[model samples]
Target chain A: KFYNFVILHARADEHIALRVREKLEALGVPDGATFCEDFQVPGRGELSCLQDAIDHSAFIILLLTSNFDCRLSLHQVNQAMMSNLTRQGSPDCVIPFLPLESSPAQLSSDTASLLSGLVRLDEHSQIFARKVANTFKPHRLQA
Target chain B: KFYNFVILHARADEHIALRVREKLEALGVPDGATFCEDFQVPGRGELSCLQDAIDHSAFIILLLTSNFDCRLSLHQVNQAMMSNLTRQGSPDCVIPFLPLESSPAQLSSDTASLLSGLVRLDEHSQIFARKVANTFKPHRLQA
Candidate 1:
């Protein structure tokens, strides 16, 4: 089943990812609106999981941190997914979630480019949840 | 006395701005590092306060909202303040906080310009607090 959102992060950062999930739920994202490979795998080795996440969800929330093991794969997956989304006409699907202090060296060029004008998910869960949930929720007229 | 940060928000958004202050404090921002005009006024009808906030703070957090009564003043203040900071060589002093759904027409050109490539404060306070507190906290060697 396709979802509106996906949580993409390094396995090591699962704890933080959990918090992101918890907060999103508290903010009223419908239960089935989000998917996380750690818990929501349809069936996958990572390659399929990434493809699944890219196509199955409207937005991919990428948690940027130093813990990602294969920096190259992170770049490639996002590159393919972002471009793929672009071809389909919605280029802004992969959202970058950042940490307090991680260098570009820790991420691939593709991810760094995404972070260039990225809004730092400031210190507050409510604000972050609103951004995501609103995307999932239907928009109002004249807004 | 100078503050490292100041929050310049509309009077009507006091309740929300209060949360900004509270979150920053919880993040270990120094007791005196931040100044909010609503609570930290040195004495003024806004002009001196803006000047004080401009000169005294290393950063001013602007909470963008529909509540600002004098749209012109908001623009002029940020325009002057942003340009003023640029002249002093720290061009990135004003930080804009936004709502989930508001039009650019509600903001002045200056604020909208700042928001142009701005980072949306995503859902999460820990992420936001760390961004601010790290500025006040001394830098460590190599990172």
Candidate 2:
């Protein structure tokens, strides 16, 4: 079965990625539910891991940080775009969750637009979690 | 009738405040609609003017800049707090608009929280005007 959510991060900031994972765990996220392989690899392996996670997860949760403008983020964004394109006949499965406190200008044009249009999840965590749960409940999945 | 919106600035930044006022008027706000005032006078007059504006306006737009952390802002903040205490019966009136990009950590705790919780009016002219129209639309106001 696909993981419920994949946490995407720029490989350069593995420490932040670990911290985010720990945060999720502390919030009682199920074990093995969040895949964070991007932090473990370096160079091209990082890209491969990110692509694999994006392809397999039910939804993508991008962690937007200051380094989101870096080259690694560019590659990750491209991979997500391709994933959505390939799965167009399927469904929209990528969603971004920004924890950084900055203007939406920090994001790329496409990503920024997407993030702003979607309801902010981290700002009201419990309400957002309820909304996400209702939308992506197990019954919604097709065998 | 009292001005429903107030714009406050440091005395030294009168030129910038005037430009800000002009921008607001250009966006279809009536002439003298926003209560624009500066803390120029040395003592009580400045404090009284700021307090009066805070008490009268439905929303307060504070223009924050590098120099905004001076004695004037502190005085204005304290007076606003006093007025706020008196007007606790009707909340949602004091709004702080940040014209410049500043770190949340750099700002005083109370000001940071106020800006974060209130609806942020976009600085971009066209978008902001549309937002004002939408917000002040008759049906939305009724609801």
Candidate 3:
């Protein structure tokens, strides 16, 4: 909640996440959006940091992959996002990046509906840039 | 039932299905596998013909695409295949061709499980050919 958005992804999909961040850069969303894990810690430390990120961030960028749903870290991130969403009363700020291999089936119905139109990360990065440009516009810590 | 396998697809994904068939041809799986629709009927006649194809085919090749699952014709083809699989008692003969945009979520768990591995139709057509060759060997209409 300290930032406008946080990206949730499995470690396996880190490279893919970078591609998404690259598209966001074209929209001039700021280098401090922190595509890097400023929140990584050992075990419980990671959990505590994640919740805070979820609580503060107005927007969520979930890089949905086949493995993202199965990983424990990704699971709790989604769970924490739900809790934050419950408090926010549906901010409608999630922009899911569905790459070639990812699918809607990887997410729960609750989490799926919380997200926006699928910004498919195909060759057309224009779709990703357009969606990110629309959301990250003027979204700041005034909240 | 006439062919060893049948390719069920949405007309939108017809080209992608052709790519799938091209790979299968490399595996010597026979052109008679019928990637083309032999059973296109204007109405209930199509349903009747689809059931007959489903009744005989040992392997059901689902060209899994987003449109493939949602189309009314594709829905009935999947439905009929389930009935065929039911009568066959777990043949494990379904070979799903998941193109870049396709996902397992498009199918029911029952239908998903009936299929073999996720042969992603990537640049690696070798994977598709290997799986198709492994499956198509000696499977015939003695039944």
What is the clash count for each candidate, in the order shown?
A: 15, 0, 6
User: What is the per-residue lDDT of model 2 for residues A1-143, given as tens digits with 9 covering 90 to 100?
Assistant: 46556777764465655565666556545433334442221112344455567766666767776677676576676678577768745455666665635344566664455456654455335565565555455543233
DockQ-wise, the better of 1 and 3 is 1
Candidate 1 matches the true fold with a TM-score of 0.41
Which lDDT value does model 2 have at A26? 61
CA lDDT of B23 in candidate 2?
69
lDDT of 1 by residue, B1-143 (tens): 56656776664465666676666667676543332332311112344445666666666666666765356546645564565556555555566665434445576564455466653453233376556655455531120
Off by over 4 Å in 3: A32-36, A42-45, A71-74, A100-126, A139-141, B1-143
Question: Candidate 2 docking category?
Answer: incorrect
**Interface RMSD in angstroms for candidate 2:** 19.8
Tens-digit lDDT string for candidate 3 (A11-82): 677777776666566668765343355565556465566666666665666666666655475465457556
lDDT of 3 by residue, B1-143 (tens): 36656677764676676666665667677654543444321112344445655666666666656675454554655675567557745355555667655555655454445344543343334465555555566745457
Largest DockQ belongs to which candidate? Answer: 1
Instruction: Identify the runs in model 1 with alpha carbons over 4 angstroms from their true place.
Output: A32-44, A99-113, A123-126, A139-143, B1-143
lDDT of each: 0.54, 0.55, 0.55
Docking class of 3: incorrect
Give the DockQ ranking, best first: 1, 3, 2
